[PDB]
Symmetry: D2
Subunit: 481 residues, 4 copies
Amino acid sequence: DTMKVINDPIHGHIELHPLLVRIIDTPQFQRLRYIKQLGGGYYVFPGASHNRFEHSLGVGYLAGCLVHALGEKQPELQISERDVLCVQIAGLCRNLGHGPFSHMFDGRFIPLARPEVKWTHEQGSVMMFEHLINSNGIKPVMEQYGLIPEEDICFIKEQIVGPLELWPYKGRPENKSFLYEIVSNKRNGIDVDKWDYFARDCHHLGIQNNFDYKRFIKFARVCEVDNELRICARDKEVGNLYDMFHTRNSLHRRAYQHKVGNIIDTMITDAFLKADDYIEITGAGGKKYRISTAIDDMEAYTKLTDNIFLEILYSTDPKLKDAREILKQIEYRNLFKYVGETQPTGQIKIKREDYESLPKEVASAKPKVLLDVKLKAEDFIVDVINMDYGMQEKNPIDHVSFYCKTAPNRAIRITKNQVSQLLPEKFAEQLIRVYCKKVDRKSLYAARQYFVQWCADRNFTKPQDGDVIAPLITPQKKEWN
Amino acid sequence: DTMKVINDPIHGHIELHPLLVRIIDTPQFQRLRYIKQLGGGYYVFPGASHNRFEHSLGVGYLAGCLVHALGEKQPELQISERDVLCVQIAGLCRNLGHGPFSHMFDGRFIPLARPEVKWTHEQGSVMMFEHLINSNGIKPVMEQYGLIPEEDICFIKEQIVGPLELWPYKGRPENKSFLYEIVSNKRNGIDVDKWDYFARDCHHLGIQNNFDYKRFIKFARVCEVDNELRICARDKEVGNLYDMFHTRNSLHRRAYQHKVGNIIDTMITDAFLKADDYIEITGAGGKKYRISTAIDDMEAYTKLTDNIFLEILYSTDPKLKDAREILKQIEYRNLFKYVGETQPTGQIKIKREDYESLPKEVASAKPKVLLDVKLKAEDFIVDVINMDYGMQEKNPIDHVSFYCKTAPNRAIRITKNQVSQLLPEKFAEQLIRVYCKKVDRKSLYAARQYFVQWCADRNFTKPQDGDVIAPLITPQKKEWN
Amino acid sequence: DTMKVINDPIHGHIELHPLLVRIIDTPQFQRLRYIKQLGGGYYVFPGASHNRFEHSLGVGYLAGCLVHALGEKQPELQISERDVLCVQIAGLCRNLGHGPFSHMFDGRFIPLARPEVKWTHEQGSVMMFEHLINSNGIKPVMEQYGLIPEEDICFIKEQIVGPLELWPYKGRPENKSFLYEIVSNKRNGIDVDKWDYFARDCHHLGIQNNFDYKRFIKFARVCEVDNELRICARDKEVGNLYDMFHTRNSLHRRAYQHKVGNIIDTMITDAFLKADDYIEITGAGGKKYRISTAIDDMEAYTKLTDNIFLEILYSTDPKLKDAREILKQIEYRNLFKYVGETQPTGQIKIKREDYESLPKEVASAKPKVLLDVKLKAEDFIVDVINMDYGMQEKNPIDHVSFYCKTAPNRAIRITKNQVSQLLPEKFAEQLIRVYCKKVDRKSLYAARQYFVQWCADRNFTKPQDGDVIAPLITPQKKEWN
Amino acid sequence: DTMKVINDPIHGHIELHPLLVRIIDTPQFQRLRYIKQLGGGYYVFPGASHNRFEHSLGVGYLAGCLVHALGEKQPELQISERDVLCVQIAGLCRNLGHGPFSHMFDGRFIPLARPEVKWTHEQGSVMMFEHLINSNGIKPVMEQYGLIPEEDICFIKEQIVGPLELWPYKGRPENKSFLYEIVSNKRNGIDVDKWDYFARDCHHLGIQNNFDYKRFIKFARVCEVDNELRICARDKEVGNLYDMFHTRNSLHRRAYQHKVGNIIDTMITDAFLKADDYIEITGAGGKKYRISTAIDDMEAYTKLTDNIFLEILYSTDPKLKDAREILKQIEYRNLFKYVGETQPTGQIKIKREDYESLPKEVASAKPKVLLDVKLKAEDFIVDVINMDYGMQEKNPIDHVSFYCKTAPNRAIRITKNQVSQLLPEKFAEQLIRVYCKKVDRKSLYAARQYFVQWCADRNFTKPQDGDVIAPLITPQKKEWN
Ligand SMILES: Cc1nc(N)c2ncn([C@H]3C[C@H](O)[C@@H](COP(=O)(O)OP(=O)(O)OP(=O)(O)O)O3)c2n1
Ligand SMILES: Cc1nc(N)c2ncn([C@H]3C[C@H](O)[C@@H](COP(=O)(O)OP(=O)(O)OP(=O)(O)O)O3)c2n1
Ligand SMILES: Cc1nc(N)c2ncn([C@H]3C[C@H](O)[C@@H](COP(=O)(O)OP(=O)(O)OP(=O)(O)O)O3)c2n1
Ligand SMILES: [Mg+2]
Ligand SMILES: [Mg+2]
Ligand SMILES: [Mg+2]
Ligand SMILES: [Mg+2]
Ligand SMILES: [Mg+2]
Ligand SMILES: [Mg+2]
Ligand SMILES: [Mg+2]
Ligand SMILES: [Mg+2]
Ligand code: NA
């Protein structure tokens, strides 16, 4: 039990403390080797074969880099070795809750399979961390290295998920407030998890990263802001922080929300829903779970990975035939068809709780055109995509604190108009894409008429080639024509 | 006289046609080995040692890549080998007119030394191309490779400078209109010269490039727009084109307009102005020129490179003592001190003719604070920087045309609101930086009070560090809190 | 059916002809998404998540690049569009026969499971290509794009596996001999499959590539050598060819034969052998196969991927308990322990048929050291690795032909002594690694003594750490000090 | 006077201690901005525009990285902050003594201009460091940061040049012996100066680096070897150390000893020799120096940079006409022509004192062929190149010490045969290149016959193109033919 060195292509040679090695070398952590970072994105970007495992190593490494740098520049913060280890463990473990195909699972699958439950990957990360610690005897090893599990497990979970129910945290007191801004920053979103995925996703996607996290670390300092110690950036780095959120948005546009990647995620989700009654995942006491109920037992969840796709694709049971046929269509590239895209107008925003009603609304639109085929609710997919700077409608840079070179302990704010008139005026928008599971030319022509009528009925923006693919619908709506 | 292969770190192994080799292997072209691409930027970014020569090779290479690709995908454009060569020569030669320290020369030095003249590096490029061709017997070699010098020299110069005095070009007829969009695109600025410097500057600066020119080329086509053939992009690339101008702006912000890089260029310009009466450059017929008049004689201009800096630094002539002293202060890093940065508010746009009044205004501000030292107008430098998307106040993407995959011969426009609500609302702005020649702590404290008061008096934006550098001045202005 | 552009992180935007797209979009080709290029190497190098799929796209792309370049520089070769497509298809499909964990399957598993059979991934590639063509109606699409399936299928298979039964090939006549040197070069090993994996493996492993394939392509020409047309290199590039084989050897040393990577492949192979009696894969006509017999039916083999590992790891069947326990030990990092490495001295070359006797020899060595524990044959693993320049004992550069600048169609030979005295004198060697399945410190201390004694008894090389791991054994051997 | 951050493209954001900033911001250090790292190599590799300045920053940074890492892992070494600073300063300053065009100056120019003197860039670095310290008041700033100038200046100079006159060093006692292995390692050549130029030269040249210095640092430890503390490497990294010297050799072959790069350096050297009587460099007290005597006066040497080339190229003095004509021919690419290359056979080695006699030997060969032109001694250039692993005929890995994982304080040796049979059998060789100053086809044909005959007469290796350039000469020699 000494240090291991691991060679990562993004970060080079990284050192792992032996307690971190003990955490990594568990079924709960090694599971992340079998979950793709970008899910169905790999079916569009063939370099994007990378998994949550290596990303987790990277996050843990960067968490260590930031906390060490702060402690070397500011010994008055009294950052301890124990603090450093706890921060590295939180960084390492904050992806433990991801399910098959990452965001597909918590973003698409669980909301449709278990609409009553409130599941997030962050909650999953805490539950899975706890399962990891308790199933592998990690607490006595934490003690052996000078951690106090009672306080430190709490601190680690709070770094992942936020306050577990006034300084609201219990794992550390207010004089270590800044430690909660490293792994998952709920104040403004500037955290080490982003820094890893920007570099790693870019390396794999074939799109080049333009944010420099190392520079950010060299300029970061802790200062008192409204009687709390916070991580501040140097004033003249404000431009680079606007660019960082721009880079995130650009990665969503180019890659994460690619229209074919999203439809592949939708098709996989559909196959899972059709397979859900038949796939068995064994959990504690030999109880059997399904894909949708594995989240209720961490022993079952440990065994729920991207493997489910192949278990379905390779099955021979006739009960799995419909699920298997969807995955086969993905292989033949016979995809659900893109019908069109629109945006709401203004601050107008469709909420998650209305998502399920949308296919029905589209199917109930009454286009005044002669239609051969009639389509049903279940023939449409309606994908609602939120493109924002991580804080809904808010500018995250308004929630960053800065210091200037002449008074490095004094925190200040910088407004948008102090920076540049070329920056966005809004920080959120929503795209709505519609697709049809019926792929013949008749169906697809009809689907477009339903779609364009629905856009008119909802006062959404005119679809870009609306005059060509629905010439009899677009003239009713005079802001469009 | 066959093909040469050259290994460039940005583009890899590049082929040069023997006619291009004949052009390169002249004193007029080789001169570009002694002119830094980024001028005083090298004194801030020590990787930025690269010169105009290797940039020119790159531009020539990319010009060839684009024109070849268009001709392979669209043989109906009738792009000839002669067209290809002429476009490669224009690309290669469009940096010939740059002077010592690149933009310092035409952006700062000549405007102050010869305020009566209208000099641009593009005009210089034409004059120097002509001098290159005539001094080295290139016309018979052009004939040998199928070029018609009368027409082709005209075409090449027109690609560099625009129309030399209703289709306005004489080098090629309207059916080859698209060939004028490759090397220097006056309609929207999307040209191969940017593509080279984005990649090359980034490689040397230590900032990573996020634009993919190869992707753009795969998706580019020529289409008829308002009865003219133009280079158009696929519809789905619109987002990437907004990102490309965002990348340009970001490189200006981080590197090209770095506040210390700019002050170094200012100090070098000041040394050149003080040297200008005394340095001699010999030109045609043994006539003597100065730094400021070498632009009038291409034989003299051929010998005007970054060497002037060292000729001044190493001089012993007592007449050069003042100029030499400024350069010596640069070496000791005794630089004019940065005081702050502000922007005008609104459509307000400060013209060149008002630049001279600005140091006076700063010095006349009456901050209501006890000051030991008093500063004079001559102690302040006020640097006004125009930041835009290359078409003054206009959105260049409104001047690009796009096609969709199922109707590739129909070009259309895409508006800003069809793409995203998160895009810029303005496309031009001004930054104003102030510096003080007096460098002691007393002077610099006073300078900051004058500066912040001046910003308040002019209704300019609050400086980012204003509450720290001028705590008594920032509360008077209620627009600021 | 138009061309698709795909973004690959190694090669950028690559074009896939519609025939290639039809081949790719099949269950037989998409299978390669679920087979890791480097097998158990991912368990050592966490960047090495890449699969055979994206490697195959790269090899197809590079095959296209070489054949196009040869035809552009030398139109007299009469390379047709049909030739180009056949070479691209061979490049794309030459990885089709790989099994779970790539080299683990054909290098370790099948030799132990079916010692009587002679299976290679190349034979598998041919069989799988045939199954792909016949199950997906590809022959009519080949006809549509100008191929003649009878001859071209033969040519493609010959490019993958060599002559299918005096010019020995039937797919193309001798005047196109050079086309068989692109995808899998049996004459000297210089082929585009290597060029892709050097770049792609390095990008993912975090080890940097030093070979420049683009340079090689610019310098490659076809010349007549001993009455046959061959791909020749420029004379002065001979040093870069020696470096290419040096790079391959270095990648084997650092990554592909990593001692822990190899032990993980050994442990996975051991789990597969224990699982082989119980896992069933359904093939053509509903016949049932095992992991070891799936190679006999392409319908079954289509469903044999890295998924097998997870099928075993997640099983609950008591019959799979022993197999599952081995995989669980991998997850806990309870790995067989590395004891040491040695080499034979001289021409001595251990053959496959003697591999089984080696653990017995190690266990029978009589070290003169006090040992508590006694180890048996079954406690040792002995891994024999052949390290060479791809042509067993031969120098591959002796099988390359070169041209000089003054006579570019005239082939010559270059001997090793004309190039450098710093080059290898031998081109093949064996490494022998020993490991212990008993993992406690007593057992491992004993294992090292048996190991070092065995090396002394066999006149093998002194282990690098021999004086530290066996201080009382190394002095007996005077060859060693 | 706090820390500065500098963005370097190779190492990223680097911190410079304020004492280092004071050293850098002097005319003696800033001079290195005007000296190309690779001299005439820029005239072949157009990316190789980088200067000694940025390389120096890199060496200083890496020296700091190594010494810090050793001190963090091994606090028992008692490495002090003072030690760290002294090592960083030596790393920063060990390139101060380079002259115009780097190796051209001390490798070609000074040996010919001042054959009586024994000048090395390392001696120049010491002299220039002394001049820097004394002219800029650095000693009291050293005191201010805890250095003891008397001892520490000595230590710094000893790190650059070796012992300044039984432990032979005075700057530090034997218990800090390992500190002398960081900046310039005279025992085996493994030092941080190589590590910087490998990465930086590669970045600029367009050749990719395959050595990982960060890995080496993670594995380096200090251990007692023959009663002295030395930097040792981990046993299993021995292969990477062989690769490191292979990489150095490969960079020499591809770039540093490029045949055209070398002829350009020869031509520049010749121009400097012809200019040397006439160019004046002013030094201390207004005394005048020449190019060849500026090495005797650090004030003059401060002003001796690559600018000399342009001072000659731009001159009008008739006395400089001959020098100026040579440089003009370089611009027109009218270069002396490459005739061929050969090697001696065996340990046979041509020494420096015989270099001048070689053109006479070539010219006295009697080729048995009809020749039109006859050539004389002064028509030939003979360039002798020594290619080795840095220790003449010796294997530098024999002078490295290693530790193993089970006994990390115990140093051991590893022999070549313990590592691999594929390694070099020799570690030094010589290349001889011949060139002709007469460039017409007749002269060059004759030159090749003299050359190839001379090779046959001296039993040198057959030129690679010998059968093509001299078909009537190569059959006489049966080893060749
Ligand atoms: C850049 C590059 N070069 C290598 N030569 C090289 N060898 C292994 N690696 C990678 C693989 C891993 O990600 C990491 C550590 O591998 P390493 O072989 O050092 O550790 P291992 O645990 O096998 O050895 P010991 O227990 O004996 O110390 O470094 C390498 N990376
Ligand atoms: C990556 C890498 N590897 C090399 N081994 C290597 N050798 C030269 N170069 C670079 C330097 C130049 O920029 C370019 C062409 O060099 P090259 O040596 O081919 O051209 P040269 O004109 O000297 O030869 P010939 O006239 O005999 O054909 O390629 C290399 N680049
Ligand atoms: C990657 C990238 N991004 C930037 N946004 C950026 N801005 C400057 N640099 C480069 C230029 C220099 O090599 C280094 C330090 O520049 P910096 O501008 O931080 O320092 P400066 O001395 O001007 O400001 P202070 O005195 O106010 O702190 O960082 C940058 N590099
Ligand atoms: Mg290990
Ligand atoms: Mg987050
Ligand atoms: Mg050449
Ligand atoms: Mg432009
Ligand atoms: Mg498509
Ligand atoms: Mg092969
Ligand atoms: Mg500064
Ligand atoms: Mg050295
Ligand atoms: Na700059």
